[PDB]
Amino acid sequence: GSPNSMATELEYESVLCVKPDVSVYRIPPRASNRGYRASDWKLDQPDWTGRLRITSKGKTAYIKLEDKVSGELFAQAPVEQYPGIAVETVTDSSRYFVIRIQDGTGRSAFIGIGFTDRGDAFDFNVSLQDHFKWVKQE
């Protein structure tokens, strides 16, 4: 389907990754001395689960979260730099992340993420490492 606003611009996004099972944390904090630390909030207590998509329109990737049954959009997070505010590693274990999503009303929210596998989360990282390796004046 077409986007809610269109003026014949380059409103595309090219698929980079899919993962079969993913869980989220609507976390309380923003900025602790070490980052976010999953150990501080909800690392065993998700609020939603579904399916992962990652897409990219040029230098910008979009983490898009999908329903496990029908593929319907839960949330989306635009990123133009990695590491950044739009995808961060908690403190260090890349079993988890934190991303900045849109709420779809002209506003944003931060959610933590936890995966079904430690390697599926490390591949969520690598899907963005190999997206930012050829930009960022490298």
């Binding site: 999953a38 690392l43 403190t91 274990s93 079993r95 490390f122």
Partner: peptide, 15 residues
């Protein structure tokens, strides 16, 4: 609650 699987940091790694 269900389990504890704290984010790594004493080695700070990957695979």
């Amino acid at each position: 609650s269900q389990i504890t699987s704290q984010v790594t940091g004493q080695i700070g790694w990957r695979r």
